[PDB]
Amino acid sequence: KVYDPEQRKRMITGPQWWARCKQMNVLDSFINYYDSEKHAENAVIFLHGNATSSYLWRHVVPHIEPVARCIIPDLIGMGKSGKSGNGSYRLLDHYKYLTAWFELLNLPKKIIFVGHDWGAALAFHYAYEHQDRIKAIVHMESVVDVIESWDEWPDIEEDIALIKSEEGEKMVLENNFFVETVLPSKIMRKLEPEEFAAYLEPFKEKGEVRRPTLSWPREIPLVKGGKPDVVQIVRNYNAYLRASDDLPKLFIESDPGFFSNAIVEGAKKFPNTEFVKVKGLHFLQEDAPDEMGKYIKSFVERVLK
């Protein structure tokens, strides 16, 4: 893998990004976030997933800012956000902080969500519980449905079995598996040193600080072997999304992707979905940010008219 030769010229380092962010206290902690402020009649909330932070969206967001207010948090325990008060980082812990944070943002009645990975799960669950607050949903490499079979998936069955076992703590708390192994593996280009450093920084130290990156995959909604509360959450939102004929959606497929291939047929079960494609693996924002930004912009513009 090779550096994109034109990237250093436009690179945004961690410190450059964090300087453009602000914080809001939320319950017993706080959230770090980027807010583009302008055009606040609409709000496009971008949610990262495991391993990453708001930083992931840094080259995507400029495309959408001119048409709507863009708001991009670091999920609790991730990026430069605060930690969860009880040290728990399950989907519902993340949701508790995220929804409390939304209350303080002065959002419009109908919100646009853009979700990746577990950040899409959070958007979908929010939508299920707030069905009157949703203007549109963009999703990518997302938690679309429960998992009944590994057939169309990347070969991670044993990785997941290991992660769910006591081996998960070694892989993640000790070895930083998601940052040092998964992250670069699932970006096609080579990240600039400063870009990788921005992903590493929250999790640079060994041990419990890395917990969110272990808790996320342990939420995987496997019908056989999964945590049943998350299976229920996903089943519930999946049925709601299949029935949501009047809710515009955009699915950004990654080619060849990481699990896009496994979830696309599921994404097609959600009506009113526009489909586009970019070249990438899992962390597609790092390989096609401008193409993604333009597709999202175009979709948002249509939905606002």
Per DSSP, the residues of the chain read ----TTHHHH---HHHHHHH-EEEEETTEEEEEEE--S-TTSEEEEE--TT--GGGGTTTGGGTTTTSEEEEEPPTTSTT----TTS--SHHHHHHHHHHHHTTS---SSEEEEEEEHHHHHHHHHHHH-TTSEEEEEEEEE--S-BS--TTS-S-HHHHHHHHSTHHHIIIIIT-IIIIIIHHHT-SSPPPHHHHHHHHGGG-SSSGGGHHHHHTGGG--BTTTS-HHHHHHHHHHHHHHHT-TTS-EEEEEEEE-SSHHHHHHHHTTSSSEEEEEEEESSSGGGT-HHHHHHHHHHHHHHHH-
Residues pairing with 193 in the sheet: none
Please state, in angstroms and rounded to a whole number, the distance separating the CA atoms of residues 44 and 70.
Answer: 5
Please state, in angstroms and rounded to a whole number, the distance separating the CA atoms of residues 204 and 198.
Answer: 10
Q: Is 282 annotated as a binding residue?
A: yes
Active site residue 282: yes
Active site residue 106: no
The one catalytic residue in 59, 118, 195, 219 is 118
Q: Is 255 annotated as a binding residue?
A: no
Please report the sign of the dihedral spanned by the C-alpha atoms of residue 205, residue 208, residue 212, residue 216: positive
Please state, in angstroms and rounded to a whole number, the distance separating the CA atoms of residues 39 and 41.
Answer: 6
The one catalytic residue in 42, 63, 93, 141 is 141
For the beta sheet containing 43-47, the strands, ordered from the edge strand earlier in sequence to the opposite edge, are 22-26, 29-35, 69-73, 43-47, 111-117, 134-142, 249-256, 273-280
Please state, in angstroms and rounded to a whole number, the distance separating the CA atoms of residues 266 and 268.
Answer: 5
Tokens of 169: 């703590």
What are the residue ranges spanned by the domains of the chain?
A: 1-305
Please state, in angstroms and rounded to a whole number, the distance separating the CA atoms of residues 291 and 276.
Answer: 10
Per DSSP, the residues of 116-131 read EEHHHHHHHHHHHH-T
**Resolution of the PDB structure in angstroms:** 1.4
* Cα–Cα distances in angstroms (integers) from residue 266 to residues 6, 104, 133, 141, 155, in the given order: 36, 34, 23, 11, 19
- C-beta neighbour count of 205 within 10 angstroms: 10
The one catalytic residue in 282, 286, 287, 291 is 282
Which residues, at least 6 apart from 130, have a Cβ–Cβ distance to it below 8 Å?
none
Please state, in angstroms and rounded to a whole number, the distance separating the CA atoms of residues 252 and 120.
Answer: 12
Per DSSP, the residues of 175-229 read T-IIIIIIHHHT-SSPPPHHHHHHHHGGG-SSSGGGHHHHHTGGG--BTTTS-HH
Active site residue 117: yes
Strands 111-117 and 69-73: unpaired
- Nearest CA to 96 among 31, 50, 49, 172? 31
118-129 and 91-102 helices, crossing angle to 10°: 60
Tokens of 37: 């402020």
Name the region of 142 (left: φ>0; alpha: ψ -120 to 50; beta: rest). Answer: beta
Please state, in angstroms and rounded to a whole number, the distance separating the CA atoms of residues 212 and 232.
Answer: 21
- Nearest CA to 235 among 222, 225, 247? 222
**Under CATH, which architecture does the 1-305 domain have?**
3-Layer(aba) Sandwich (3.40)
* Cα–Cα distances in angstroms (integers) from residue 10 to residues 3, 13, 192, in the given order: 13, 10, 11
Active site residue 290: no
Q: How many CA atoms lie within 13 A of 195 on its CB side?
A: 22
Contact 54, 121 (CB under 8 A): no
The one catalytic residue in 50, 125, 139, 253 is 50
Question: Terminal CA-to-CA distance of the chain, rounded, Å?
Answer: 42
- Nearest CA to 150 among 262, 281, 282, 265? 262
Residues pairing with 147 in the sheet: 222
Which residues, at least 6 apart from 248, have a Cβ–Cβ distance to it below 8 Å?
135, 136, 137, 272, 274, 299, 302, 303
